């Protein structure tokens, strides 16, 4: 995250760290949606153009973390993956449309002060919060700058959702209804963005109606980090909810 701040302890208890077994490295962010399921971006796992094709056995999920590199004894929980599910129509050839995927944990994780799931939005929540100007929050241990360094602790930044047209007009990539973009306008004099290392992480919003946190987006793509006139694109969780339900019901939960 570029231009964010240190998160407070237990501030995003659904924040998950996708961790590479070997070499040991941070792959991307992710989010805990229940005791056995993690949500992330398909591209964090599969991206043929770069020869990226991660498997269950290649990864580790670390939950309840704060510090990026430390092994937080008695705080974090590390789990293994039972299965990975990528959206059958994720479009890695053209614009990462439907960049989403579910990971089923080998075993349910126990909630604690530092580990707790986020809610998935319903039609109405989506309808009310997913509006230009409304702000969401992104969190992650990704880079602090486009080229640079790296944070010690989880970072956070709040960003405004942007109108579709401005989104479209900011890039040459074909934008779909399964994405939304967010960030400040050059004009705004306020910066911030997700960056390398943050993908797959959650873009969340707090409902003013029921006080709960909802994940409306997944950090998906962007051209550079925090560049002027550029925005972050996120997977539209709600639009892809049916697929999410489908998978959790047909395979576990």
């Amino acid at each position: 995250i570029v231009e964010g701040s240190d998160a407070e302890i237990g501030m995003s208890p659904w924040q998950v760290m996708l961790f590479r077994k070997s070499p040991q490295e941070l792959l991307c962010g992710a989010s805990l949606i229940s005791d056995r399921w993690v949500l992330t971006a398909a591209h964090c796992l599969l991206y043929p153009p770069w020869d990226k094709n991660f498997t269950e056995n290649d990864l580790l999920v670390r939950i309840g973390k704060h510090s990026r590199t430390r092994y937080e004894r008695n705080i974090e929980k590390i789990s293994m993956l039972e299965k990975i599910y990528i959206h059958p129509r994720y479009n890695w050839r053209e614009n990462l449309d439907r960049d989403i995927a579910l990971m089923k944990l080998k075993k349910p994780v126990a909630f604690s002060d530092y580990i707790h799931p986020v809610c998935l939005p319903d039609r109405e929540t989506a309808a009310s919060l997913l509006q230009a100007g409304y702000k969401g929050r992104v969190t992650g241990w990704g880079n602090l700058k486009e080229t640079w360094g790296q944070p010690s602790v989880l970072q956070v930044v709040n960003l405004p959702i942007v109108e579709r047209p401005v989104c479209k007009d900011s890039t040459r990539i074909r934008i779909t209804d399964n994405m939304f973009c967010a960030g400040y306008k050059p004009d705004e004099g306020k910066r911030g963005d997700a960056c390398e290392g943050d993908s797959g992480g959650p873009f969340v919003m707090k409902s003013p109606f029921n006080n709960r946190w909802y994940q409306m987006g997944i950090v998906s793509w962007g051209e550079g980090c925090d560049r002027d006139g550029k925005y972050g694109f996120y997977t539209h969780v709600f639009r892809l909810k049916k697929w999410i339900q489908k998978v959790i019901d047909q395979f576990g939960e």
Binding site: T69, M80, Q150
Partner: peptide, 10 residues
């Protein structure tokens, strides 16, 4: 830069 995790997780 990553601190070692327990081998039970590997």
């Amino acid at each position: 830069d990553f601190e070692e995790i327990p081998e039970e997780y590997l």
